[PDB]
Design a protein around this ligand. Structure first.
Ligand SMILES: Nc1ccc2oc(=O)ccc2c1I
Ligand SMILES: [Zn+2]
Length: 197
């Protein structure tokens, strides 16, 4: 399957060396991809496409959709109930955060800063336990570009998302923030392990 090889390639090629030396997400240069499942939730898909059409109409007939990663200990709840801003602290406030680098999303799979790592071994660098990440369709619409912390409750006026851009004093890598759960669809569920270098 070419569609699934495309997802594996995005997962592998977007890995970066992290500033925390692997503290949050573990030490690795690549993953062992175990499974890639396409999520088919009709109710969530229509909530997503309905919002996407509204955003496109408010953004010069352009949804500004991107495929982005999301790491969370609550992936199962997300694939069933969708993203939920009511469950959203954060550099850009009360939003739902996505990354274009899979290894950045991997830092959130076991909690903020990697939490205490895997449930079985309490290891943020566990090579044994299988992890899950989502590869999502995200509607950014008119995205507000920001470099420094800007604690928002909602998108800035006239905007549909916030894009955090890398800066000397700030972010190492980009991040994308939405403030309405219906602006993302959890399209692929990736089951994987981080691999020992
Ligand atoms: N602050 C922040 C930045 C990036 C993130 O990427 C994810 O995948 C999930 C959560 C997340 C968070 I909270
Ligand atoms: Zn483990």
């Amino acid at each position: 399957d070419k569609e699934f090889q495309s997802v594996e390639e995005e997962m592998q090629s977007t890995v970066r060396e992290h500033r925390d030396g692997g503290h949050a997400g573990g030490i690795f240069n690549r993953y062992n991809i175990l499974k890639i499942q396409k999520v088919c939730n009709k109710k969530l898909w229509e909530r997503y496409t309905h919002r996407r059409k509204e955003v496109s109409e408010e953004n010069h007939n352009h949804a500004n959709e991107r495929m982005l990663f999301h790491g969370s200990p609550f992936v199962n709840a997300i694939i069933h109930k969708g993203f939920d801003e009511r469950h959203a602290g954060g550099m850009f406030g009360a939003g739902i955060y996505f990354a274009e680098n899979s290894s950045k999303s991997n830092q959130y799979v076991y909690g903020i800063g990697g939490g205490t790592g895997c449930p079985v071994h309490k290891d943020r660098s566990c090579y044994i336990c299988h992890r899950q990440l989502l590869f999502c369709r995200v509607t950014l619409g008119k995205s507000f570009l920001q470099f420094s912390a800007m604690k928002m409750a909602h998108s800035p006026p006239g905007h549909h998302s916030v894009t955090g851009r890398p800066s000397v004093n700030g972010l190492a890598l980009a991040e994308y923030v939405i403030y309405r759960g219906e602006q993302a669809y959890p399209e692929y569920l990736i089951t994987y392990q981080i691999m020992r270098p």
